[PDB]
Design an enzyme around this catalytic site. Sequence first.
Site, short mmCIF file in Angstrom:
data_model
loop_
_atom_site.label_atom_id
_atom_site.label_comp_id
_atom_site.label_asym_id
_atom_site.label_seq_id
_atom_site.Cartn_x
_atom_site.Cartn_y
_atom_site.Cartn_z
N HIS A 15 -7.82 -60.16 -7.34
CA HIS A 15 -7.09 -59.31 -8.25
C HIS A 15 -5.60 -59.45 -8.03
O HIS A 15 -5.02 -58.77 -7.18
CB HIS A 15 -7.51 -57.88 -8.05
CG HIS A 15 -6.95 -56.94 -9.07
ND1 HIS A 15 -6.78 -55.59 -8.82
CD2 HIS A 15 -6.46 -57.16 -10.32
CE1 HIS A 15 -6.27 -55.01 -9.90
NE2 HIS A 15 -6.07 -55.94 -10.82
N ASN B 100 4.46 -56.16 -15.43
CA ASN B 100 3.66 -57.39 -15.27
C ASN B 100 2.74 -57.66 -16.48
O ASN B 100 1.79 -58.41 -16.37
CB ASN B 100 2.85 -57.34 -13.96
CG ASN B 100 2.00 -56.07 -13.86
OD1 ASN B 100 1.73 -55.46 -14.87
ND2 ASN B 100 1.64 -55.65 -12.63
N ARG C 238 -10.51 -54.72 -16.84
CA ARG C 238 -11.21 -54.09 -15.72
C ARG C 238 -12.59 -54.74 -15.48
O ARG C 238 -13.28 -55.05 -16.44
CB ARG C 238 -11.37 -52.59 -15.96
CG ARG C 238 -10.08 -51.92 -16.54
CD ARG C 238 -9.05 -51.49 -15.44
NE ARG C 238 -9.70 -50.83 -14.30
CZ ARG C 238 -10.01 -49.52 -14.22
NH1 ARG C 238 -9.73 -48.68 -15.23
NH2 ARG C 238 -10.60 -49.07 -13.10
N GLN D 30 -14.12 -53.60 -6.19
CA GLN D 30 -12.88 -54.27 -5.86
C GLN D 30 -12.33 -53.62 -4.59
O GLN D 30 -12.27 -52.41 -4.51
CB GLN D 30 -11.95 -54.03 -7.03
CG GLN D 30 -10.89 -54.99 -7.21
CD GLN D 30 -10.41 -55.05 -8.63
OE1 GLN D 30 -10.63 -56.04 -9.29
NE2 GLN D 30 -9.77 -53.99 -9.11
#
Lengths: 374, 374
Positions: free
Chosen positions: A332, A146, A284, A313
């Site tokens: 995310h 990805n 991040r 997260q």
Amino acid sequence: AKVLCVLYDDPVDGYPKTYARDDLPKIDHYPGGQTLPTPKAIDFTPGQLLGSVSGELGLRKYLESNGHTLVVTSDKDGPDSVFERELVDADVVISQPFWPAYLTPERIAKAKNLKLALTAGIGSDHVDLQSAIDRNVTVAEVTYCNSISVAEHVVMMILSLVRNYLPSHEWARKGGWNIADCVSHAYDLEAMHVGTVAAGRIGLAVLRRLAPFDVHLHYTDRHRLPESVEKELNLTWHATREDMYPVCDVVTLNCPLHPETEHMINDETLKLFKRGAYIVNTARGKLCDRDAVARALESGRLAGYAGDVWFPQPAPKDHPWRTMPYNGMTPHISGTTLTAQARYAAGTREILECFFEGRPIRDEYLIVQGGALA
Amino acid sequence: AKVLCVLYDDPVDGYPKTYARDDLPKIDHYPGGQTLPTPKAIDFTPGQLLGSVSGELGLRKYLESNGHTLVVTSDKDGPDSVFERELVDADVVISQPFWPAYLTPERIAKAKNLKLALTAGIGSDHVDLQSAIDRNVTVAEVTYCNSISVAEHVVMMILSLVRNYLPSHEWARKGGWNIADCVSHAYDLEAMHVGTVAAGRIGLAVLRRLAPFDVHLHYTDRHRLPESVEKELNLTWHATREDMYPVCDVVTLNCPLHPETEHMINDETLKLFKRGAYIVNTARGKLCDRDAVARALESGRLAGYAGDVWFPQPAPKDHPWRTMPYNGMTPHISGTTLTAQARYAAGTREILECFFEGRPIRDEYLIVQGGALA
């Protein structure tokens, strides 16, 4: 063998029965020529939702027809979860960075059968590597699955911040017209200075996609790209992030989180930025001081901030980045488009076939060889 | 001379005193090598809001210091407006396509001093050309001033539809996380078939920006591009729009509105589209049957529709495109970023200097030579 697979919940209105489209584009290789995953077969139709509980990465028939156990759950947090209960005798653990099942020293010690920790996705931030190494646990990732997806999200985000798309869309959605309110914060991207922190698989893909926008491209990394690349993209190299920020209209972070990169974007480094800078961060969340960015947007030091990564997260309901001005956030998700899923479901299976059949697992996949072949 | 300039209202909370940034990128030419506007001077700082009432395209000091009258208003509609009252003795009329002051046969007949109709922007859809011609009224536009701006909006929109950005952002904005709900309609753009209807200044700029996304590029136009262009971009040519639609994942409309192109996207042509097609339309709203598109998105024939153009315009409060599913609309704004404004304010002034000083007006600017030089 027992496979313990953690995935995110199905959509709140159920696992989809239909999809927007009937198939996915055909791709044979990644830029640089790494081949797309090569499992012996797949038991899904690419384009299906695979990374949620009901999708099961399309693994069940393969593993069970081969005599294995597959346990899938989204319940992954703390000592009472299905994950931690099932972990004790699992041979293989699989999760995605979008819903990571953390393999801490503690959890690994409890994982008495653990032989393989597979990231359905890229990387290993959720796995304690020393601990994996001390137990001869193979750590594998679906490298590159990805990188492109993220790079597209990055460029989408950059354009959308610069052109003030999200407030403009809200005016439309809400019955407004309001041209001046839309465009008093809206610019063209053309001929801006855009810089990336790191030019790896993601950052290079980003640079290549930015080039015909006619931007001035900058980068910094541990090492320079080949001269031929720097030349084809007219890149300006900066030895340090700090050297790069001041000349950039847009800065995109495509680097690893390290002890040394944590809060690298904070109240003091943000002064190095040009006034009205835009930041995109799909790397991040903790690369950035959360309230420092919120402050820079209230102040106008930054004219935009967007990303899909957050600290912590999942982002709590009240995370300031949800609502700070000129934000272009998503949960995310960049590397979990249906397209990416099809690739990493296939590579997850590819790796398990190699692992179980005693064939070598691609070198590009291996982070820690355990008792796997390479 | 009397100059009558129609512009859109200031922002609802006032004309801005500060801006997100201190300057704009330096650009010398447009792709193909047309030079950026060359007035003798400008009386604004590029990046200022120029296309709203208080901005006045930065024209006032120039015109008044030269003995001219400038009347600026946003009041442009129907027979009682400031525009129509002031029109009767105006030598020069200027408006933007974003807030066009229509020069109908009627209005032109009433315009007893009218010598020049200037589009601060591109085109002349709001001017009756035969009528302009019958009165030796020069019609000029700031050619190319925002072709790039629009192309960037187009690519932003395409990515955002394909990747499901706007619903994903709403989940973030509203306190959600909801990965599956975000990504059960989200794909990568990579290796999709994207086609443009027309490859003019806009559509070519779009194609060039799409190329490193690794999409398969298609186009149709009245005529083919040079072979060298088709080759550098690996373009597939289609003789007709109808030939092109079926193979495309994404179709973007970058063509003129004509008697023959009106509602060219309607309930029957939409069947030619691949299921889950995306349409981006920054061309003209009436290129598309308004309810036909709304139907195709309720049906899933289309997986996305976005643009900044509408019928009619301004879009009424209740226009279905504001709220139809998977829309990525903005009000009519793509060519009126602050960046574009700086260019067309400068070209508007350039044209007026030539016009008033009896110098020729660039040939690329002229749509109808009146009693101007060329």
